[PDB]
């Protein structure tokens, strides 16, 4: 599958480093660091890919989330990333990504954050 | 924390049933089932929460994410629901998701869908 | 068309008000008052609509933008919601918005929120 | 403001062409041509921008809305661009969109893509 591909160390275009080892049946695990925002150091990540992606050139699909708390700083929130692993000479996850934070009811409205990242394995 | 509030059984507004364990150290782990799309039985999720929100009144984040691939069917996507426990007589997770499909890089313009799940502990 | 359906007061789950006039081209014109957020009085609305949607029990696609500044306040920022009016005798549009506000550079991988309204024609 | 700096052609990663003129009073009208999809020639586009947007070095907040039906084709869906304007040298419209299609009430929760689009004033 892209078992081999995905594994490894990932940076986005905000300088976050995003460390991921791919399992056999689909698993997701590793750390996150982000360069931005209420975040120090390294966060637990997990998720999942399809490890039977189709062969006919398609992207192979996958999703991971970090909660933003660990032994020096917690953020009250969490993002989950969602996208699409495409390799080659220039491999590449392409995500869109959504960031809620704790809120009362009354601010439940304006509780999530939504963007984009590219990783690439360089830089 | 709200370990024992999140831990459980969960229906949203599309009769999917999500099943889940929260763990001591944030993690969640479980099974999906969806009653709607390309999708049949249950398929592994995985995912984190915040273990020790804030105690004003405001919510636990949380992420979680379906790869949906399973011993019978594969649809080669991937869903990530991001969202907040709110307890109490009427608990609910409340969530955005982002479903990501694989695609050439031709049509990866057309590849994410976005939406929303309340799920809650009854029906 | 839904020209007649569209067109009037449209109320959403947080008490916002919604008065819109669907064109016979595909316009739509009216104000918006929110109940919630850097928000007071009315603001100028526009937008478009499918006005010969199918006639297979479809929804009609639309959509519409506000820009939060008026002769009384000023947030810097606008929302666009993007939907599909549902006819008959509990009629109703549901959306999706993107709230973007102005940031610097360094503090634009922040600068976008995402919900969900849905909208009446009472209450 | 920057009246002068939005009006005129914008191109995107696309390949597609977003002709605007912003009025003083915050208004955008134009015309936009997508190089993907189902589409053909040029569609109606209506939106609002932040006519008296911060002057610390904040982007200014904008939106617009096109309905995909034209004298030639009609995909009975619409496109809503939420974003800021980033002037200077190298100016861009950052923008995020949620792409709405009509839909029946059992296929909504599928109804609405989301995506980024970045518009430059070259290429
Ligand atoms: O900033 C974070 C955690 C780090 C997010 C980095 C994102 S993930 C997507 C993108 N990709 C990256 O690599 N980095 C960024 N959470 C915001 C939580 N706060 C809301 C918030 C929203 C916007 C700006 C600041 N805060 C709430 C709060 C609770 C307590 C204290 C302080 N604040
Ligand atoms: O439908 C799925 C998996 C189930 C999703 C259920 C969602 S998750 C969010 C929401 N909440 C729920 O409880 N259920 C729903 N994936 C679509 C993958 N296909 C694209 C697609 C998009 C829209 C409609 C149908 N297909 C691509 C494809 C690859 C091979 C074969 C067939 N199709
Ligand atoms: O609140 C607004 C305008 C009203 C939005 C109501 C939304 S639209 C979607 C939803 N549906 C509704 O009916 N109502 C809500 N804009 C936030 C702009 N500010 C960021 C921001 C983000 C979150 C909370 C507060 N502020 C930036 C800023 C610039 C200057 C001063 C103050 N603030
Ligand atoms: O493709 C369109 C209109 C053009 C969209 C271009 C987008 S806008 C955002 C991005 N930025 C750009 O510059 N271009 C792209 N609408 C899809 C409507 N169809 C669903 C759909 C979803 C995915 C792929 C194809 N179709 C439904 C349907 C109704 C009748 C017939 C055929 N199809
Ligand atoms: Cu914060
Ligand atoms: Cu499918
Ligand atoms: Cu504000
Ligand atoms: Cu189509």
Chains 1, 2, 3, 4 share one sequence.
Not at 23 to 41: F, H, I, K, Q, R
Not at 58 to 80: D, E, F, P
Request: zero cysteines; proline letters at 1%.
């Amino acid at each position: 599958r892209d078992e081999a591909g995905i594994t490894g160390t990932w940076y986005n275009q905000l300088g976050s480093t995003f460390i991921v080892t791919a399992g056999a049946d689909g698993a997701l695990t590793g750390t996150y660091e982000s360069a931005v925002g209420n975040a120090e150091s390294r966060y637990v990540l997990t998720g999942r890919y399809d490890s039977a992606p189709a062969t006919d050139g398609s992207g192979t699909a996958l999703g991971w989330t970090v909660a933003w708390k660990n032994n020096y700083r917690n953020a009250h929130s969490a993002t989950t990333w969602s996208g699409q692993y495409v390799g080659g000479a220039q491999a590449r996850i392409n995500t869109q990504w959504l960031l809620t934070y704790g809120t009362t009811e009354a601010n439940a409205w304006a509780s999530t954050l939504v963007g984009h990242d590219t990783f690439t394995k360089v830089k």
